[PDB]
């Protein structure tokens, strides 16, 4: 006996748009439905609940941990824990790894993971306890500085993206035509209703009527490659990157139930997906969105797994630049890739999106009743994150 | 097979006061010190680390994942990962906990892991997104609002304090006593030179003059019992727990160098201990500081150990009302407790406490022999977090 | 020798919606409309102006001396002078008064005078020099603090609205009846044309497509007694005033362009009318709303005229509570204040209101053939202000 | 008869440095001491006072019209009337002939008349109410953008100061020559006791201490000339005006009590001079130092003086450029000219200046035995203001 971990259930809330949908709802309120949500998909109590990990980038104002506003929100008892954490753009994966661990050592029975962001709630701030004697100054946007930015070069991730473009000789049309295929396919499942087990509806609060929310908003209808080859180049003036193949600024919160096989079976579950290897490597910062290559690479080798072996991947777009050099380096068969579409469609709410790929994913795998399955995603400052997942 | 993590080699910086010798000193700089500090000590090189993890609870402004800010700026290679992670007060040592867990699962062999906090450095913030038609609005202390405050029912940390001087009807004497207790015994070991192992030296790079700083400058120097009785009480107008009774604002980082007990025999490196367990449990938030009872409970029972096995005990002090509620609980000898003083006189830098205080107990369980130890740090919003260590 | 001041033209930018036609469009920019205006009705050059004065009370963040920002805008040479000035309400028609006496006493022949406001790019503000050490502090919207709140007694204008409800005993229905007759005078007066005549278009420059601004866009079409009815108070909570029987918050600018009456035969102008008398006078903070009855007489009296020698008047209407109480007090017939509605409908941008008003006055009393006319407003820190004009 | 106007009397505070004295004192408490004064210093009772008249730049937080505020503390009746106005750094001497014209046209009795500013009080502000979707953005400090930025070319003061260094070839030396001379002076005179008069103590009310301040803390003693030559310019990196030779940012209020010639004489009041003229004029933005010129000239015509005629002389000294080549141009006697020193040495209250000044001028006038004497300013944006002053 290794320890051999399960997804008993999972969980989204629709991704909304920048200062849409969940405008002004904070990422705590998401969280606290998901776990909610989990829970009841798992025919879990959230008694039994031991803690919660919420992989969150942008978390200022919110108050002490938002992952513990979640979980109290969502009824798990004062006895359990919960934590955050913060792997950037991979943390709503890494989140789930490192609640799979919990459980491997024994520390844990019962554990929902997965992460949470609210862009559009993110504050804007500055540093003013020695004071500004005299003069100007600015007020920061956090999302920016500590969401999309490099720390160490200080350009947006989307100059990496560009880096990443020369490198690998992608053109304008190649992207371009990234963009709409994410966008039309996005559309598509959709419409069929292929976005409806996953989702959780979100019922937003309000003084005038509660509104419910269940679809993805920031999914664009009919998008036409002219839609996407009349943009400027966003970062640089004879650049490539746009903000029409590149994903945006959204607000999710996505997330999975995790025990033991066995306790699975003791409990009757018919689990999403047997947790079959992770793993996290490091690039270089300039070229970030290469992440998955190695990544993806070594979660493989650690399953015993061949590229081919595969027969559903979600590999996170973050820009259409990377997400080509990533499925050109892979080799894999860009036909069992992002098939609901992507992020440049679905949008790419920091903290959730792991959990949210990872979510689309395992309900697609269980639909088209697809044995093995790899989620992957870039990260800022130069990381990957990937994790396979195999049918029970 | 059951795997065993031993700490190679720690360190952290001394603890700088409110806006004081850390003032405008980013988090990850603190950090990047104590990297290398715990490779230097331990005769391990930065190529060689697979991962960092750092607890950090205050990032806003800094700029994307200070962790990796840190692992870099240590030369800590582009391949290896970083992340950050915020489980309040408790992070800086469950950051350990979750770095042993890395080498336990056999997805790292060498993991740096703690904290690093820089209250000082912590900005005002508003969301500002959706604007703000009229009326006045707060810029946010984001210090308080996310690292000092109870989320749920609003208040400071000082009122849960208040709840357990109620609880356990400690007197304000009495409170006072520890108080004044806690500064003699840090000035005692500052003095006679036990914080110098500890202590990695940081240059705090200037302008007209670097200023190495290598003292924890929080502790108050020949601390009378009338300078404590004299304050007026902080957060209820008539009862217990004041300024003096309470833990400070404050900046620094500490951290561990882990490895299995298999690879630091190989290296011929002599550990400061290994990890024999760890539990994290949580309490109800109104009394977040009786954290400690069940954590070390759980922690201890989890090792096959009795109370009285302890040799050493680092219990951190947040307020003195939670440290002799703990303290009467558990039972345990208090003169084998902060031994080297605590918190109240050594500060609480949030993110990095519990690093700090595992610093302080690993040391000091070198220093005088002990076979037996264990850390353990009450967290806001209600838990506790707890670590036994066994001497080699 | 006894002077003789003539308006020879005037004209006011259409009153814009808080936040609405005119929301990012500074108040100097609608002050300068308006100076040319007056300058090209008047058929006098740019450069024959000496002085320009413009009432203006929330100039914070608009850069140096927004009056003379204006009036080089609009052309007036270097080599003539400007200045601003604050009597709060009624800066606009006191600016016009100031006027009058710098051609009375020798020091200059050609004045344009009025007020201008943007309520909505008045910013919020914090004294943040001293630094903020530790703790929330509040950014404060200079629209409320510096234009709507009471220095003396720290509540709003709305609640010295209430006062002077309960002192004259005016009921919500008498108050409502006045909010619904002064909607539906302006809404007849606007689609009648008879607003055309004083207002001067105003370009709002754009980036995608320029917009002429003409037409009044807070009188609310329609206005019934039933909506009126159904609103709730707005300051006080079982009170009477509401947002339906109060003005608004609004942004526009109206000017006036004055020289002797000889000056004015010179040229071949012809008028729009001669001051003969102006005057203001304070009261109680408490009662502000009371101010134009002291006022009103003060100006009949210097003017050496009776009150039933009136043909026409225009009373700004702060509050349905104290417009309905000055009328009652001085008992000039109702059928000949407020022809064409009042604030209630059109707004009250602060600063230009008193110049606003003389406007609708001044061309009502060209348009009906009245001889008489008065001009009044209520100011709040408890004064009045008021100016009798007669037709050539 | 004639409009005889006379300045019954006249009282100053000290003036404050910047951030100093008077950092936490808003300007209509230093505006209420003086008009308190004004009245005693008459022996004239505040219910006699008809309206006060105070110029004040830098309002921004203070609540609604400071004016009235300053006037109510002071104990000026509700039956009065008060406002302010901005000439900008004319706007303290332009109210005091604004208030004699309140008198000369027979609107007003008693008049008091003068200037403001804090300043040190002047708020960071920004426009919000759109709110800021994306980005970074300033916060802007008002003293600066609203007070000592030309809101044309865009530029500080200095520049402009500059501009005319250029024009009049007055170099390095010689402007640093006119600093150290306007020290000496100003130090001179404070020891001799030359401002006492003048000056009215105003009461810093503290918590852990009340302060009386009664001494111009912005005056240097002992100032060298090398001192002053080893500064580095301010505003041209390689310009010539500095610190050291330009006025200072500062705090202070300063007015006059004003009634006809014939009332004076009625309540046995000994005056301290007649209001004989004034003029106010336009000049080259780019050039604002040199409005003391023509505002001066026309000033001498209205009087029917020559500028011999002059036997005391106050020239605000905004900086030692723009000051040189007003008395270059002018030709007066340099030895009559800020006898006591001036603004460089003083301090510059922006709204407050032109009524410091005018003090230090009727109070030396008395002292010396000078018959006819002239106050005079520059203004930012390009203007003049300036009054001649004749001793009965």
Redesign the interface.
């Known amino acids: 006996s290794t320890?051999s971990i399960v997804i008993a259930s999972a969980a989204r809330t629709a991704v909304g748009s920048?200062?849409g949908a969940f405008?002004?709802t904070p990422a705590h309120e998401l969280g606290a439905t998901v776990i909610s949500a989990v829970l009841e998909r798992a025919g879990v109590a959230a008694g039994e609940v031991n803690?919660v990990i919420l992989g969150q980038?942008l978390?200022?104002?919110?108050?002490?941990?938002?992952?513990?506003?979640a979980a109290?929100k969502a009824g798990v008892?004062?006895?359990?824990?919960?934590?955050?954490?913060?792997?950037?753009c991979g943390?709503g994966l890494?989140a789930v790894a490192?609640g799979m661990?919990?459980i491997?050592?024994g520390?844990a029975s019962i554990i929902v993971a997965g992460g949470m962001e609210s862009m559009?709630?993110?504050?804007?701030?500055?540093?003013?306890?020695?004071?500004?004697?005299?003069?100007?100054?600015?007020?920061?946007?956090?999302?920016?500085?500590?969401?999309?930015?490099?720390?160490?070069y200080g350009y947006h991730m989307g100059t990496t993206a560009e880096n990443v473009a020369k490198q690998w000789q992608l053109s304008r049309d190649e992207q371009d035509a990234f963009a709409v295929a994410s966008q039309n396919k996005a559309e598509a499942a959709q419409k069929d209703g292929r976005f409806k087990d996953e989702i959780v509806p979100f019922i937003v609060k309000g003084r005038k009527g509660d509104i419910t929310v269940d679809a993805d908003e920031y999914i664009r209808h009919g998008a036409t490659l002219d839609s996407m080859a009349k943009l400027r180049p966003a970062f640089d003036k004879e650049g490539t990157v746009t903000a029409g193949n590149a994903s945006g600024?959204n607000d999710g919160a996505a997330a999975a139930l995790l025990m033991s096989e066995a306790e699975a079976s003791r409990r009757g579950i018919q689990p999403l997906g047997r947790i079959v290897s992770?793993?996290?490597?490091?690039?270089?910062?300039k070229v970030m969105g290469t992440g998955p290559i190695?990544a993806s690479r070594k979660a493989l080798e650690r399953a015993g797994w061949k590229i081919g072996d595969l027969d559903l991947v979600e590999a996170n777009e973050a820009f259409a630049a990377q997400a080509c050099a990533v499925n050109k380096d892979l080799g894999w068969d860009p036909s069992i890739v992002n098939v609901n579409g992507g992020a440049i469609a679905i949008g790419h709410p920091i903290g959730a999106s792991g959990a949210r790929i990872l979510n689309t994913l395992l309900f697609e795998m269980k639909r088209r009743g697809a044995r093995k399955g790899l989620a992957t995603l870039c990260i800022?400052?130069?990381?990957g994150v990937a994790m396979c997942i195999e049918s029970l």
């Open positions: 320890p920048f200062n405008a002004n803690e980038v978390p200022a104002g919110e108050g002490a941990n938002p992952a513990r506003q109290m008892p004062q006895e359990a824990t919960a934590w955050g954490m913060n792997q950037l943390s890494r490192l661990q919990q491997a050592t520390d559009s709630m993110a504050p804007h701030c500055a540093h003013l306890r020695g004071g500004v004697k005299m003069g100007d100054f600015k007020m920061i946007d956090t999302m920016i500085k500590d969401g999309l930015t490099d720390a160490f600024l992770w793993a996290t490597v490091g690039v270089d910062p190695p800022g400052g130069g990381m």
